[PDB]
């Protein structure tokens, strides 16, 4: 009773794996053929692009590439821009008539 039961249910597990495996293979195959049609059509269209179209693809990619490059600047805090001479020039004028 234990043996016949275990054997019958093990065959069910194997039947499930086989049926699912075959269904999956049919989907992967069909999906590959559809995706190849995209690659082919995209290629047959792109092959006809002129310089103004090639420039459009790059001009569309620049903002994308720029945004990801500039993101770390969001963490900038202080920025100090000294200028005009290469020295530590602290000239400040005004008396302390009353400060201790």
């Amino acid at each position: 009773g234990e043996k016949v039961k275990q054997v019958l249910l093990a065959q069910a597990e194997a039947e499930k794996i086989r049926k699912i495996g075959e269904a999956e293979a049919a989907v992967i195959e069909a999906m590959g053929k559809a995706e190849a049609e995209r690659m082919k059509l995209k290629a047959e269209a792109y092959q006809k692009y002129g310089d103004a179209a090639k420039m459009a693809l790059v001009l569309e990619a620049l903002p994308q590439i720029a945004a990801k490059i500039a993101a770390p600047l969001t963490k900038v805090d202080e920025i100090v821009v000294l200028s005009g001479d290469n020295s530590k020039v602290t000239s400040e004028v005004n008396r302390l008539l009353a400060e201790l």
Partner: protein, 105 residues
């Protein structure tokens, strides 16, 4: 059933996208310099937006001038335009297409 059906949706969508590019490719052949100019003019402020935007997060900026030098805002604003100008000359290194309406090549 769902897999076989989805492959048809991908294929149907693929054919439509391909005819879009085909007609867009034919239209680009008419883009003389007077039309190409607008492509640069539209995307120049957009590239400046994604470069300047994250830089505006800065909490404080201080400018100090001395003797011979300028005040400083010119340096600050200059860096934004410089990063924007450095980018097109940078991508040209990994793909020979030009982002400079003739003038040089």
């Amino acid at each position: 059933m769902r897999g076989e059906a989805e492959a048809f949706a991908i294929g149907a969508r693929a054919r439509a996208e391909a005819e879009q590019m085909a007609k867009k490719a034919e239209a680009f052949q008419l883009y003389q310099e007077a039309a190409q100019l607008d492509m640069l003019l539209e995307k120049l402020p957009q590239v400046a937006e994604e470069i300047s935007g994250p830089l505006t997060s800065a909490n404080k900026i201080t400018l100090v001038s001395s003797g011979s030098g300028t005040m400083g805002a010119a340096k600050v604003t200059g860096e934004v335009l410089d990063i924007l100008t450095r980018l097109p000359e940078s991508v040209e290194r990994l793909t020979g297409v030009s982002i400079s309406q003739v003038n040089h090549k």
